[PDB]
Every structure is written in C-alpha cells, then in structure tokens.
Symmetry: C5
Subunit: 208 residues, 5 copies
C-alpha cells in the first residue's frame, strides 16, 4: 500500500551502494549491451574514434526487492542510492561522458536496469574505415575491480537490429556489431576478470 | 503572515527531490518549450550543430503548495531542493551545458517553472542550411527513465515569434520552429516514452 | 568583545543563503559594475568575444549586521555562506569561469561586496573591431529568476577610467565603456526583469 | 561469519583517510609500477607527450585487517574511504586524469591495491622518437608531501614485459621501460623524497 | 606521547579554515616564492604564456602548535582542514590548475607550508622572447579579499638558482627571476592589497 516515496525510503535502508549484492556467495551476473547511437570524430591516423552509445546494463540486487501487490512495481532511483557494477572500457582514452540523468530502473523483485547515454573516445583499429569492408573497432568493457568470482559479464543475446538506435545523420554506417565474451588476465593480479568484447564494424558512407 | 524563509523552510520539509510527484496513477504533466537564443556552430558534412536555447519547463508538484493569502505567492528555489523531470535530448552528442543559476520558480499553487539557458550539441539534419529554404534540425527531448504512464510531455503552442529571443548577431537566422508531441519506443523496453519533437528550420544569413 | 571567529559564527547562524534578504518588502538593490581586464579571443565572423573582467557586485543584507564598536567591522566570507544575487549574462555563450577565491567582503552594517574575476565568452557585435571606430560589444547582466519587484540592478557609477584595470598587453584597447541600466520582458513571463547593459567599445591596436 | 557488508562497514569505520598508516615508527612502504597502455600525442618540438598508463600501487594498513577464517579475504572499496599515498608525477604538465572507477582492493591482511588507468601529459625528452633508437621519456613519480621517513617508494619488483599492456594500435611502440627507484631533494626543503624514475624508451612505428 | 592521528585531531579541533589566524590585530604574514618548472604554450602575438610553477607558500597559526619533543614535529594535512591565504594571480587569464595533492605541512611550532605545483596562463609581456635579451613576463600574486592590514605577503628572496627546478626540456630558458614585494589599489577599493611581483626573464633556445 506504500507509495513511491516509501519504496525509495526503504531502498535507502536496505541498499548498500558500496556493497556488491553477492548472494549465496555466487558472482553477480551483469548483462551489458551497447546500443550505438553515433560515430563522430574518427582519426584513422591515430586509431582513435569518438562514440556515443547507450549502455544497457542489467543485474539483480536481492536487497532491493519489495512487495508490489498493492503498490507500484517500478521506480527510478539515483544510482548513488544503489550499488552499481564498476564497469569500464579497458581501451578507453577518455573518461565516459554521461549525457543523461543518472537514474536506474528498479523492479520490486530486485531487477535493476541502468542505461546511460555515453560519449567516449576509444583506442582501436580504425584502419579500413574508408573502404568497402570497413573498419572493425573493438571495445572491451568489464569490471575494473571485481574478478570472475564476484562479477560475471555476459552480452545480452538478442538479434535486435545493429543500427536500430544508430543516427541516420551520422557520416558513418554500421555494417555489423558482434558482442562476444572474454576473460582478461595479467601478471599484476592472479585471478581473471570477465569482459564483453564489442566489435564495431563500420565505414564511411557515400564512397565511390 | 509568513516570509520567504518560511516558504523555503516549508519546501525543505515536504519536497521529495528523488520521488516523482504523481497523483494516483495519473502521470506528471511536464510542459517543454524551447526558446532558441543562438545557433553557434553548424557542420554541413558531419550534420552537427551547437545551439543555445532556454528550456522552458513547467509542471505541478502539489506537495509544495502553501497559503499565500498574506505572504509571497512565489519564490526562487535551488533545483537541488525540488524534484525535477529527468528530461534529456535523445539526439544530443554532448552533455547539456547549463549557463544560468540553477533555480526554479515555485508558485504557491504548486506550479513549478525551471527555465535554464542551455548550450548543447546535437546530431540532426543540416542539409540545405545554405539554401533559401534552409535546413531542418529536429531535436527530441523527453523523460529518460519514466515511461508515459509516469511522465507526459507536451509543447506550448502560441503566437510567439521563433526569433523573439534569437540573437541578431548569430551567423544564422530562424525561419520557423514547430514543437510537436511524439513517442519513442525501442526493443530494450516494453512501455513507450513521451517526447517533444522540436523542429528548427534555419538557414545561414545572406548578404541581404 | 567579539572576534573574527565569533563574527563568522553569528553570520552562519543568521544568514539564509537560499532566501533573498528582502527589506520592508522592497526589492533588494543590487549594484553591478564590470572592470574589464582583458579582451582575448575575438571573432568578427562569428560575433563572439572572450573577455576577462572583475564583476564588482554590492548589496545589503541586514541579517548579517553586528555591532563592531570594539570589534572588526569587516570580514571575508565564502559566498556559500551567504545569499548571492542569481546574476547571469543574457548573451553569454559559455558558463562564467571564476578565476578567483569565491569569498565576499561583509561589513558590520550588512553591506556585502563580491568582486570575482571572470573569464567568459559572449555573443555580441564584433563588427568593426579592426577599424578606427572599433567594435561595440554589449553585455547584458541581471537576475535570472528574480523580477523587478524582488531584485533591482543598477550600474555602480563611479569616477574611473575605462581601462584603469585593463591589461596593457592585450592585442586590443578600450575606447569607451558605458554601463546603462535597462529592463527585459518576454511572452514567457508576465513581469519584467532588470538588467545592466555594458557597452564595450574596443578595437584592435593599430601599428605604424 | 561476517559478510562483505560487515567488512565494508568495519573498514569505513576504522579507516583514517587523512592519517598516514605508519606501522610503528617505520615509513609506509609504497610500491609503484606503471603499465603503459598507450602513447597518444607526442611533440618532439615541445618535448611533451600524452600517455595512458595503469598505475599499480600497493601498500599496507593494518587497521583494516580483519579475520577471514570464514569470510571474504578481499573487498572493493572507494579510495575516498581510505588513506591513499599522495603520489604526484614530478614532471607532469597536466593533472592526472583517472579514467576508471576509483576503487581499491583491500585484502584481509591489511594489504591495499589501487591501480587506476591514468591519462596525463608530461614534460620529457622526446628527441629521437622518429629514429631506430627511439626517444627516452623519463617520468618521476613519488610522494608530494611525505619524505623518506614517512613514505618509501619502490618499483614493483618483478621481471615482466614492457609492452604486455601496451596498445597494438598506438602510433608508437615500446622498446624498453626501466623503472628504477630514486630520490629527490631541494634547497627549499632539507629532507629527501623518494620516487620511481620510469624510463620510457619508445619510437614511432615504421611505415612498413 | 602522541601519534600523527592525535596531531591531526588537535588541528581539526582548533583550526578555523574560514577564519584568518590574526594575532592581536596584526596582519597574518604570508611568504610567497614561485619556483618555475616549465614555460609552455608561448604566444608573442597575443602576449600570453602558459607557466608551471611550485608556489611555495608559508604562514603561521600558533594555535595549531604542539610539543614534539617525543612526537612528530610535522604532519601532512588536507588544506580543506586548514585556513589558507586567498591568494590570486592578478594577471592570470585561466583558473589555476593544481597538479599535485592538495596537502599542506603543519609544523609543531605552528608553521604551515603549502607548495602546490600549478599550471596557469598569464597575460604579460612576451615581446623579445626570441631575442638574446629574451622577454620579461610579470606575474602578480596576492590576497584577493584581505587588505594590507589583514594579510601581508613578501617574497622569500634567498640565494637560489632560478632554474634549479626548471625543466631542461622546455623550449625556453630562464635568464633571471626577480621576486619583489609590491602593492595595488583601485578606485573600487579604499585600502591596499599586498602582492609579490615576480619578473620572469626568459627566452627561447636557439643554438646560434
Ligand atoms: N588481469 C588483470 N587486471 C585487470 S583486468 C581489469 C583491471 N585490471 C587491473 C586492476 C586490478 C585490480 C585493481 Cl584494484 N585495479 C586494477
Ligand atoms: N524505448 C526506450 N528506451 C528509452 S526511451 C528514452 C530512454 N530509453 C532508454 C532507457 C530506459 C530506462 C532507463 Cl532506466 N534508462 C534508459
Ligand atoms: N521575460 C523573461 N524572462 C527572463 S528575463 C531573464 C531570465 N528570464 C527567463 C526565466 C524566468 C524565470 C525563471 Cl525561474 N528562469 C528563467
Ligand atoms: N625537495 C623538495 N621538495 C619537494 S619533493 C616533492 C614535492 N616537493 C615540494 C613540496 C614539499 C612540501 C609540501 Cl607541503 N609541498 C611541496
Ligand atoms: N585595489 C583593489 N582591489 C583589489 S586588489 C586584488 C583584488 N581586488 C578587488 C577585490 C576587492 C575585494 C573583494 Cl571581496 N574582491 C575583489
């Protein structure tokens, strides 16, 4: 029977923003899917590209669930009130530029959806952008401090159109986008960190 | 008899900045109206524009109302102490740069007016900007996380001149500006999100 | 009987930074006078200017008064501890860049002086900058959300040289500066808002 | 029997971010190791480079130690909640830009690991970058305010690869990176401050 | 018998960051000495220079004093926990870019030292930079809101090398550095404000 103000007030009491909601000591499964909106400044010479995309991030936080029999089953909450995967583009050369309100969608069962529009610059393979096969820029996104046992990242497998969200007014066109999964590991640290490798195949429009 | 201090103190007591002020299941009615102030940069090749506009935003938050029969019926309040629509430009390629003091005007009847001066960059149709008929850049603005059942957005038609606020020193000129209501929906999300579609018809100024 | 630490204490106990210190229900008299220090990146084709100035701002706030018969009559105080006029340049195209500590000077009688050095870009008339008559760039500054009945702004007329503070190293030189008070109103809003119009007549320094 | 929520609570409640965690009267032993990921901009004329590197930083704080007999032995914690070494690149000409979530890992034994990905500009020898022997840009990093008696700096002792983390799409390549321990001192200050002189020997990729 | 935590806690208990540490109506004596590290982005046409210096700043607050006979006689403390002179470069045209941790050194006798490394752009005389006699760029730094009877500044003119800290990889070199005390006053304000005028004599490097 509680209103929306109550659902939020109760989230502040149960939600520990700095505590990863690990349950039955099993990694938190984070789903990550980049919705490409536009490809801006491209420099084949320096192998750098500016990209705008909506990062659809979904996961479950047990400590957030509530009874929605006699009340709203969803509310928007500031990400500062909840725990959020500490994801990062392993090959980014600029910090992520969040262009939208930093609010996440929370379902009464604990399901969380955070989908910010992000603009960011990447260090990838730009060669071939001005060709028919185009270039394929690969973006590695995974947790920065939570190894495979605390966080698992998997791409949301859905055959949705690759350029469904892509701006028609962009100078470039998307040929294909494949989001695979991997597990990076270095000599700095023993364990392995999961990541989703998003390969963006694009090229310039209006070519001869 | 009460001063402005009482009105503010009262707002700090009832205002819930992180909770949408909806009554029943009826969504919050947000009115959006853009007053174009300047068109700074335009790129015919990349289809990008840098513009300055005043985003006239109004809505109702009855949980803020107060008795003004013997006190001011309006006060300027910092937006941080109020709930504000999580509006965003769906095709912006830069974060909104707010140029003015972040204060809203609150009327004793619960009405809220927030009109910031914003400089922002968009990806839109720039073709024809050098012709007499000009270019037509469409800017879509709507709630980012609140679907139609939660937030409604509509323009504000009138007999106002599209150049009433426009700078005469700009390199461009406005031909016509029409703001229509529209709705967006992606395969990411089931429900639909209302948005105001602002069509800016402008061209570069001639030796005239 | 009191020291600078006690003054600050009492100030923090009576000052209401988010409440305009209305006196007798009359509008707060705000005085503003720009002291030009430099003219930097000028562009006659885009009618854009980048200038640096000290914005001399004064007003009265009775709620800050204190007896200084045998105590300091003046103290520097962070602006966050005081109410400040929500002033904005109506034709600015970049946010004000405050180059100095944000401290204000408060006198025991309630007089407040805030004079920050600001770097900011404006949209204004730059035509003729490289001619002998020079260009005349007009900058409009006034309250953003407080109308005439709440705040009043007038140029702090004081016998002084137009380039008393102007850098001798600028590529440009000031020919004249006239600061006149005015008023603005739009079909958006019923009441009027006061502003000060600063006309900066300048030109690129010749050679021979 | 305590979970991560309990551990995080304890750490946050025990950590003293402003107090150097000096065990006994010995200095705090900090280990620093730069893992270069890219060399973005290089200017031989101005001897200035723009580089992206992960700064492996480790130290100990016994106050955070907890019993992990039947509890996690590592947790992610925001650095704002921990004391962190006040490291500064002595030859940096721009503030370090942290591109990743500012979280550190704290082991149950009080061991702390913080490894952010940082983009920063340095003033260093770039002459010879376009030769087979390449250029050797040396970067000095150490405590800014804690001398040898309070903080000691040593390069992560380990025979590792220099290009392991390096981007294959960079316009440059790494020939060698020798990170040697060192010390600095000036007439300003009588004591000595330890640092880690990192020698970056790199050159531009051949057109082949 | 007091650890560094106790020294900080005492400081946190008596320090008044927003209150100048005045002693018997005498002005606080602040010492300022710039150590040049690099000279970059120089423009003889616009008379603007980018400079990087270690602004050595010292003053005294004897209320923070403690007995260090058998306790550390120095501690590093965040400036946010201390009162710091509101110093400003009068002819700077960009805000100060602080490149180092913002920590100060408090000594057991009440002395405080703050020496951040700063990168800032200035408006000054750059003419003659490419000549043997080089150019002389003057930089003024003094209190922004505290007049002569509240704050006094003087250069720590000692017997040191002007290029002791100066980078050998800079395109320029220092011929001489004279740091003299000085004062300023404008029609705006009745009292005078002290400042140290640093005359930097530098020229480009040209093996000829
Ligand atoms: N393997 C490995 N290392 C990885 S994968 C993603 C980030 N890292 C390095 C790292 C690991 C832990 C911390 Cl606190 N900071 C940086
Ligand atoms: N349809 C759809 N999706 C839309 S319309 C406007 C924004 N979005 C995406 C979205 C939806 C929900 C959240 Cl919490 N964040 C982003
Ligand atoms: N007329 C009019 N409108 C003016 S004059 C100066 C600023 N404005 C717009 C405005 C009016 C009210 C608020 Cl809360 N915000 C912006
Ligand atoms: N010698 C010397 N000085 C050094 S080595 C590393 C930094 N410094 C300068 C310094 C020393 C102390 C403080 Cl509080 N701030 C800056
Ligand atoms: N003379 C004079 N005025 C000076 S010297 C250095 C700064 N100023 C102006 C000033 C004076 C007082 C305040 Cl609160 N803010 C700025």
């Amino acid at each position: 029977a509680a209103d929306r103000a109550d659902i939020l007030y109760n989230i502040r009491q149960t939600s520990r923003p700095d505590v990863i909601p690990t349950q039955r000591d099993r990694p938190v499964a984070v789903s990550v899917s980049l919705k490409f909106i536009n490809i801006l400044e491209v420099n084949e010479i320096t192998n750098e590209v500016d990209v705008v995309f909506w990062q659809q991030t979904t996961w479950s936080d047990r400590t957030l669930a509530w009874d929605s029999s006699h009340s709203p089953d969803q509310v928007s909450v500031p990400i500062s009130s909840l725990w959020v995967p500490d994801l990062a583009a392993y090959n980014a050369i600029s910090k992520p530029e969040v262009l939208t309100p930093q609010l996440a969608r929370v379902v009464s069962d604990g399901e969380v959806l955070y989908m910010p529009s992000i603009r960011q610059r990447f260090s990838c393979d730009v060669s071939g952008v001005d060709t028919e096969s185009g270039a394929t820029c690969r973006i590695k996104i995974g947790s920065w401090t939570h190894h495979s046992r605390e966080i698992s990242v998997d791409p949301t497998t859905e055959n949705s159109d690759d350029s469904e969200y892509f701006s028609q007014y962009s100078r470039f066109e998307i040929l294909d986008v494949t989001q695979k999964k991997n597990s990076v590991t270095y000599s700095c640290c023993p364990e392995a960190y999961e990541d989703v490798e998003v390969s963006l195949n694009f090229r310039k429009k209006g070519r001869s």
